[PDB]
């Protein structure tokens, strides 16, 4: 009897590789994994906790026949790569309202990656955290309890000092219900200011027309992204920024691409409007030629009338990390800057103090002051993240 609604919250799943993040997500959503899964959440008002919490319209799982009460629909962020996840939250490409730090009771805490992940959540201010001690099935209770104390010891004196710790077995799907109860308790849905100008980061763009489609049946390009703020609706006039690269003889510039929203969809469900939360599929009137093969990846979308600065040069108040996912930043250097879902190369003009200037090879849209950017440098032929900062307009 549950309603079909868009996910209203984003929960990031982090932790060292091989600790059980994907299995965990699959144990919660029943979906295998940017990895992304959604799931409804309900509660059997008659039953007892944690068992009373469910992911589907049934209370049999805990001895009841009443229709469970629908709570909300949530989505999870889970990537296979360690550095992709780091780039995701550090650049703000994917909205995270909370996070679940996965810890394998199997190995020692904290591992190298699990460590970087904790500093990141601190960096991006993601307060609502739940530490999940996983794979407890392959350790003795004595061992389980030991690590617990180590974790609590690690969180002591930090913002994560009172963060709850839940032991589960993603593999055998045990205490998954306690985790759900935990999510509802510690990762509440945030208030959303729907009056802010609509802004969506483009993470994917496709041409869904199968070869051989008659021209009259041609469909507009599809955009896939995460709505950062505001409310998008079907029929709204919107624009892609920076837009279309235009060359007029010696002058090269970028023009906003105006279009219209023809459809809004979450998974296999369609809507007339979309608020922040989850990953959305937007149909438009755009020439498929512009969206095919993720060609708009890195762009942002907003209402056709929004006033958005599109700049070639930017100033970044920065901070360097203690490790490479660390020599100082020097002028005449070429760094990779990730603003939202876009990644652009650029050379440093000035370097005075906790601040820098950058000449971008491609301009970027700053829909707001102090948006986050990840800073990476090419080491031994491959670009590695070495810092982060805020773009100042």
């Amino acid at each position: 009897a549950w309603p079909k609604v868009q996910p209203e919250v984003n929960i990031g799943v982090v932790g060292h590789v091989d600790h059980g993040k994907t299995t965990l997500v699959q144990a919660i959503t029943g979906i295998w994994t940017l990895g992304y899964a959604e799931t409804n959440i309900g509660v059997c008002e008659s039953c007892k906790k944690p068992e009373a919490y469910v992911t589907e319209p049934s209370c049999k799982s805990c001895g009841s026949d009443d229709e469970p009460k629908f709570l909300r629909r949530i989505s999870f962020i889970d990537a296979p790569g360690h550095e992709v996840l780091m780039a995701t939250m550090l650049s703000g490409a994917a909205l995270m309202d909370g996070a679940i730090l996965v810890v394998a009771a199997n190995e020692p805490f904290p591992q190298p990656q699990t460590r970087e992940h904790f500093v990141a959540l601190g960096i991006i201010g993601v307060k609502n955290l739940i530490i999940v001690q996983n794979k407890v099935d392959v350790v003795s209770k004595e061992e389980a309890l030991s690590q617990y104390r180590q974790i609590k010891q690690f969180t002591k004196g930090t913002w994560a000092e009172n963060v709850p710790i839940i032991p589960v077995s993603a593999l055998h799907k045990i205490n998954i219900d306690s985790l759900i109860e935990g999510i509802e308790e510690y990762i509440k849905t945030p208030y959303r200011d729907l009056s802010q100008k609509p802004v969506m980061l483009v993470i994917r763009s496709f041409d869904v027309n199968k070869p051989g489609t008659q021209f009259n049946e041609l469909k507009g390009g599809v955009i896939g992204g995460s709505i950062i703020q505001g409310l998008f609706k079907v029929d709204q006039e919107i624009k892609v920024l920076p837009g279309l690269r235009v060359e007029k003889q010696g002058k090269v510039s970028y023009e906003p691409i105006f279009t219209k929203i023809s459809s809004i969809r979450f998974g296999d469900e369609e809507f007339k409007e979309a608020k922040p939360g989850g990953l959305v599929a937007i149909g438009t009137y755009l020439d498929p030629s512009l969206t095919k093969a993720d060609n708009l990846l890195g762009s942002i979308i907003t209402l056709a009338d929004a006033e958005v600065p599109v700049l070639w040069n930017i100033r970044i108040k920065y901070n360097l990390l203690e490790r490479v996912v660390v020599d100082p930043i020097r002028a005449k250097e070429t760094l990779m800057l990730s603003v939202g879902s876009s990644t652009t190369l650029g050379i440093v003009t000035s370097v005075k103090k906790d601040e820098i200037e950058v000449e971008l090879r491609r301009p970027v849209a700053v829909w707001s002051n102090n948006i986050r950017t990840v800073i990476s440098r090419q080491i031994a032929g491959r670009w590695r993240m070495i810092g982060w900062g805020l773009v100042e307009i």
């Binding site: 407890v136 099935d137 209770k141 389980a144 309890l145 617990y148 104390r149 609590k152 009172n162 963060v163 709850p164 710790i165 839940i166 032991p167 589960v168 077995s169 055998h172 045990i174 205490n175 306690s178």
Partner: peptide, 18 residues
């Protein structure tokens, strides 16, 4: 968020392990 709290959940886990 207490140890006793964590422990009870921990006992619930092993009590269902095959």
């Amino acid at each position: 968020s207490s140890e006793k709290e964590y422990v009870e959940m921990l006992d619930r886990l092993y009590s269902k392990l095959p």
